[PDB]
Design a protein around this ligand. Structure first.
Ligand SMILES: Nc1ncnc2[nH]cnc12
Ligand SMILES: Nc1ncnc2[nH]cnc12
Lengths: 223, 231
């Protein structure tokens, strides 16, 4: 009934240990752990990294498990100047930052036949809000780790006030969009995109998993 | 039994009219037409444009229909300097051109946990080779962008060994098939030359690209007739 999707082992292991009556099964190399948490039937999925992994894995989830709602968790790169490593971000909206079909007058980041961005579920956002350092804002995804400052600068000028950046959210949202399943992204910051990113990431990935997981647990507890 | 995937309507409509006993069904806004062609059970899928669309749609195909082999068709942007609009390219290998996790020492284009590229099926490539008698065989790389910007094109040139064509689905298809362990091959035709007058050329020669790609695929399909050769 409720799905939580994380890319890496560190981002899911915390939740997986809290699950009870855990029954794990692998499909196309993707781990699906199914159990009980906060009186919910929770389908935990390790999606792997990147758009295609997330899209494939999210599709398998929606085909086989049919969850009513979907939450995407894990680390992300800080983009807005107010935010620090450790901070949690709830998705208001999700976009691709590396999509460019502007040669056919789709606005930057817009996949053809898709809306320019994917709005997260109002009910889930409202709920997350009550449990709110946690912030609410736009998350954009690309198939790259944003460690290059130039790449980060190139993205700044394309969106209104991007909060965080990562590599799965938009794939998750876009799939959910077409299946018409409510979604929300809840991730924590492992680093600041473009600033010593990968050294910071290795240092604070476990922290990001922890903060993200704990907020999700309280949202579940509250849902 | 055999799946053929294409992103736009122009890239599938040609095939879809050749199908017999056609029975179409929509899943998550994706068209799946199922019928008979060249004595094969052919699942025709309009995937939509882009990596996520292709990945989702390919996954639905593999979950629901369980095809033994997968072919990806449609238009593509010419990258190698010998090739012209109209030319057909068979995938030797497929890569992402817009993937960069080199901060963790994956080579450029390599998605983490994936091989640097996805080799197409040897049997399918060998078969396609025979039917080449302009058709060529080479690497195809995918990104979530239409490569009309010359700068974007130049940036890619220096990353791969001798890229032939670029588009927006092949690597998603291959990566899914990779993990499902389903043989695949990309067979696309050139609508334009990436970075040149790409979108004006594309609108002009998309139908031609669909046609050439579809016809080659039909004769590759027809070339079985090789599981028997009797008839
Ligand atoms: N955690 C993260 N995920 C994706 N891209 C990033 N760039 C910097 N940090 C990142
Ligand atoms: N047909 C095509 N597909 C994707 N990218 C391109 N760039 C130029 N032509 C293209």
């Amino acid at each position: 009934r409720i799905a939580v999707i994380g890319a890496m082992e560190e981002e899911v292991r915390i939740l997986r240990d809290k699950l009870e009556q855990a029954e794990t099964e692998t499909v196309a190399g993707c781990e699906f752990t199914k159990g009980q948490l906060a009186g919910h039937e929770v389908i935990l999925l390790k999606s792997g990294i990147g758009k295609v992994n997330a899209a494939m894995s999210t599709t398998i989830l929606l085909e086989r498990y049919k969850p009513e709602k979907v939450i995407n968790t894990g680390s992300a790169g800080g983009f807005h100047h107010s935010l620090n490593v450790g901070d949690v971000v709830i998705s208001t909206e999700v976009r691709h930052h590396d999509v460019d079909v502007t040669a056919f007058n789709y606005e930057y980041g817009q996949v053809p036949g898709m809306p320019p961005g994917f709005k997260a579920d109002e009910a889930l956002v409202a709920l997350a809000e009550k449990c709110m350092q946690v912030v609410k804002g736009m998350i954009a995804t690309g198939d790259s780790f944003m460690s290059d400052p130039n790449r980060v600068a190139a993205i700044r000028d394309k969106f209104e006030n991007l909060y965080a950046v990562e590599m799965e959210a938009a794939a998750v949202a876009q799939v959910c969009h077409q299946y018409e399943v409510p979604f929300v992204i809840i991730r924590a910051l492992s680093d600041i995109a473009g600033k010593e990113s990968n050294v910071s990431f290795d240092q604070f990935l476990d922290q990001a998993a922890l903060h993200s997981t704990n907020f999700i647990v309280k949202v579940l507890e509250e849902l």
